[PDB]
Amino acid sequence: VFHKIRNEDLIFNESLGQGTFTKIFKGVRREVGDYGQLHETEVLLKVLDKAHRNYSESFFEAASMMSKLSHKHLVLNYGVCFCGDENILVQEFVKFGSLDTYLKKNKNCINILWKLEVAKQLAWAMHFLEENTLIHGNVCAKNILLIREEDRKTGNPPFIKLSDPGISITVLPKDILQERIPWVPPECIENPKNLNLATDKWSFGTTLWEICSGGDKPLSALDSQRKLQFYEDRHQLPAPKAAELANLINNCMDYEPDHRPSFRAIIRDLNSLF
Ligand SMILES: Nc1nc(Nc2ccc(S(N)(=O)=O)cc2)nn1C(=O)c1c(F)cccc1F
């Protein structure tokens, strides 16, 4: 159960747009921290409309279930504000933000080893979720958050965390799931009850394509109807700009869910590319 945070201890400072039936803000939390030290902590606030009851329930159950699993590559949730007409997730603010935006702002001037390190970290996170039989369901480059940039002097790689799952595809409207092709796998377009650990293996492939494509979105030129037909016709994505991961992407984006490799196997594959 999430720690409750009082509306009175939250300041909203900056609008950061919208997620899927969410409004996102940067703000500050006034808290009592380690040793009774008063802190003013930068926070990321995700606001759900209480009137969208099934969406909110799904969102906060997903966030809660994953926050029960502390992990270096999973975002820290501080708690929730049940304040009136809205329920608010209070989350750590990750300094360098979403990986797709990061790659655009840096004009894809990162080398293949940087991409491999981020891919490995994501794979380790997903391996941990797989061992805990916890489906994420919204793996994508925008939900990869950069804590730290690479430091060439120390050899430190970039360091990432994976965002909270959001509203489950089992409750979202079909048109939203179709918009989310090709992150949502074909079996889930067919029936959202086909959600399975296999789902995240497919989406991991799509996310690798993003990482290797400088933050481009695959199939952006296709509308919801032509994306649904892209699966009906069983097409695969084009090889990304950095072709080094093309084989791994194809192996993960397997139309047969049971053939998608384990994240343990995926990690070994990534290691062998170096
Ligand atoms: N927890 C979290 N921290 C951030 N850091 C952030 C956000 C925006 C910027 S900006 N306006 O480009 O300069 C810079 C740093 N994002 N974040 C999220 O969960 C998050 C997400 F996963 C997807 C989309 C939006 C988010 F907000």
Residue numbers in the entry: 536 to 809
Paper text:
The TSA screens identified six compounds that induced shift in the unfolding temperature of recombinant JAK2 JH2 V617F at or above 2 °C, four of which were identified from collection screened only by TSA and two, JNJ-7706621 (1) and AT9283 (2), from collections screened by TSA and FP. JNJ-7706621 (1) and AT-9283 (2) were also observed as JAK2 JH2 binders in a previous screening by Puleo and coworkers. The initial hits 1 and 2 possessed highly JH1-selective binding over JH2 on JAK2, whereas JH1-selectivity of 7 was minor. Compounds 1, 2, and 7 also inhibited viability of MPN model cell lines HEL and SET-2, both of which express JAK2 V617F (homozygous in HEL, heterozygous in SET-2), and murine pro-B cells Ba/F3 carrying either hJAK2 wildtype or V617F at submicromolar-micromolar range. Structural analysis of compound binding modes to JAK2 JH2 WT and V617F mutant revealed no major differences in the binding modes with the exception of compound 1. 1 interacts with the side chain of Ser698 in the WT structure but in V617F structure this serine assumes two conformations and instead of interacting with the serine, 1 forms a hydrogen bond with Lys581, which is shifted closer to the compound. In addition, 1 forms an H-bond with the side chain of Lys640 from the αD helix. This interaction is also not present in the WT structure. Differences observed in the complexes with 1 stem from the conformation of the Gln626, the αD lysine and differences at the back of the binding pocket. The variation in the hydrogen bonding pattern in the back of the pocket (Ser698 in WT vs. Lys581 in V617F) might reflect differences in the dynamics of the pocket between the structures but altogether the differences in hydrogen bonding with 1 is not reflected on IC50 values.
